[PDB]
Design an enzyme around this catalytic site. Sequence first.
Site, mmCIF file in Angstrom:
data_model
loop_
_atom_site.group_PDB
_atom_site.id
_atom_site.type_symbol
_atom_site.label_atom_id
_atom_site.label_comp_id
_atom_site.label_asym_id
_atom_site.label_seq_id
_atom_site.Cartn_x
_atom_site.Cartn_y
_atom_site.Cartn_z
ATOM 1 N N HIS A 95 0.864 -1.185 0.000
ATOM 2 C CA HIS A 95 0.000 0.000 0.000
ATOM 3 C C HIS A 95 0.912 1.250 0.000
ATOM 4 C CE1 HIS A 95 -4.305 1.379 1.133
ATOM 5 N NE2 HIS A 95 -3.623 2.451 0.768
ATOM 6 N N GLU A 135 -4.566 -0.508 -5.370
ATOM 7 C CA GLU A 135 -4.720 0.526 -6.391
ATOM 8 C C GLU A 135 -3.486 0.740 -7.275
ATOM 9 O OE1 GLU A 135 -6.013 4.013 -4.014
ATOM 10 O OE2 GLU A 135 -8.045 3.262 -4.050
ATOM 11 N N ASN A 154 -12.364 -0.719 -4.729
ATOM 12 C CA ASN A 154 -12.530 0.497 -3.955
ATOM 13 C C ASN A 154 -13.459 1.414 -4.734
ATOM 14 O OD1 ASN A 154 -10.607 -0.669 -2.284
ATOM 15 N ND2 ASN A 154 -9.009 0.874 -2.699
ATOM 16 N N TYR A 195 -15.502 5.512 -4.455
ATOM 17 C CA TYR A 195 -15.711 6.755 -3.698
ATOM 18 C C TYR A 195 -16.663 7.720 -4.395
ATOM 19 C CZ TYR A 195 -11.937 5.379 -0.531
ATOM 20 O OH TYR A 195 -11.187 4.744 0.421
ATOM 21 N N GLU A 235 -12.712 -0.804 0.064
ATOM 22 C CA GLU A 235 -12.747 0.577 0.574
ATOM 23 C C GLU A 235 -13.971 1.320 0.064
ATOM 24 O OE1 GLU A 235 -9.296 3.073 -0.225
ATOM 25 O OE2 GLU A 235 -7.904 1.354 0.180
HETATM 26 O O1 LIG Z 1 -8.337 8.850 -0.997
HETATM 27 C C1 LIG Z 1 -8.902 8.110 0.097
HETATM 28 C C2 LIG Z 1 -8.243 6.714 0.103
HETATM 29 C C3 LIG Z 1 -8.282 6.165 -1.340
HETATM 30 N N1 LIG Z 1 -7.773 4.777 -1.408
HETATM 31 C C4 LIG Z 1 -6.415 4.572 -0.869
HETATM 32 C C5 LIG Z 1 -6.211 5.241 0.502
HETATM 33 O O2 LIG Z 1 -4.870 5.053 0.942
HETATM 34 C C6 LIG Z 1 -6.751 6.710 0.568
HETATM 35 O O3 LIG Z 1 -6.539 7.169 1.907
#
Ligand SMILES: OC[C@H]1CNC[C@@H](O)[C@@H]1O
Length: 444
Positions: free
Chosen positions: A119, A164, A291, A293, A349
Amino acid sequence: VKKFPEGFLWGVATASYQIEGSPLADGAGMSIWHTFSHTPGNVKNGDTGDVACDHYNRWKEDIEIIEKLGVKAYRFSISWPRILPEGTGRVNQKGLDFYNRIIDTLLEKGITPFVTIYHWDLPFALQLKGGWANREIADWFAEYSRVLFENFGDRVKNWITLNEPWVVAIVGHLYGVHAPGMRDIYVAFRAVHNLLRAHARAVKVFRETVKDGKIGIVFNNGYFEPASEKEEDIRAVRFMHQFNNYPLFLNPIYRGDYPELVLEFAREYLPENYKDDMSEIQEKIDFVGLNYYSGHLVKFDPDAPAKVSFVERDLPKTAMGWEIVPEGIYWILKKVKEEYNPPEVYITENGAAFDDVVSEDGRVHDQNRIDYLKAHIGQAWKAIQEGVPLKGYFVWSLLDNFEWAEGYSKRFGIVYVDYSTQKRIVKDSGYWYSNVVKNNGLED
Ligand SMILES: OC[C@H]1CNC[C@@H](O)[C@@H]1O
């Protein structure tokens, strides 16, 4: 009522550099995030991960918070340079001891560890040798992964090679916004390709050393929608999904080549005999982590590199400036089944940054985050009802933490951290989430 399948994994997620602090404690080598954040101008307010959440010392209490909230799974990452300070060769017993203590504590308390191997905190010593740009990283990463499997694989059974890799390659080596801070499109696409080769090599050694384990990989994804109903805009959407979402890596892993619009854009930037590596890249995985968002309205634009611009929409946004589009999480879950049909999927995430304040009552009333989580958890439930093999859901994050080039100014936690004292304050969203884990789903 929206009840989830029996044994659904409700988790929280962190990353080593974002929470730990003490980057050079106990014989750890420097990472590229240490050197990057210590370079003036790279990070908002000059913030670094020197202290962060001081999780390196406060790990027991943080796990106790997880336990108390009743969450069933903890996704955390391992700092490669704590384990192998030069990246290869010497193994640091005290680094292994740090993660061993965490692992044993979680199991004793019935929390399932999901370990992210990488990571973003590459050992600086390897960056000196080109880092992700060097083909030999597939060997270095294999050696590192092997060490983690041999030491922890007896207890940890759920493993993630990369977090990612699009960000790692493009933001790190093309945009220069993340470590190692390079701006070279040829290096960036070599890094894409080496990320795949290293991921595949790690999976291969995992088959040899953890007989009863499961291993996957995590991608970032946005929900891209076209600005107009015109032809070129719908195509601009098709490029962005292929480049920015999971197909960039899953097309190689499942079909043995890069996606078609990615090759139209980037074949000059990829290594000359990249195809020779494809057979090894197809190494079979157990799960895909997605992930999610935000969504983005996009349109064709002839003046933009990549021929795509984002167009701003009048929609509710987080402190990141990110558009809140809950149905994106459903769309991406649907789409991953449609395109590649992985046997299991996790949301590894999902979460939101808001300007959290401690009230006079001593509480953090982040109704805006509750609303955010609830809406997306609802869409994830919907995806399950239509047959997506979703096995778990991880909130980013357990703790407010070091948000990369934004530093401490963006708070994603369901637990608030007062950086001046290191006090943890469970947010309303944390109590709320604690209730949905107990109920195994939503209720109203
Ligand atoms: O930008 C928010 C999050 C996105 N995915 C990886 C994370 O390390 C980050 O904090």
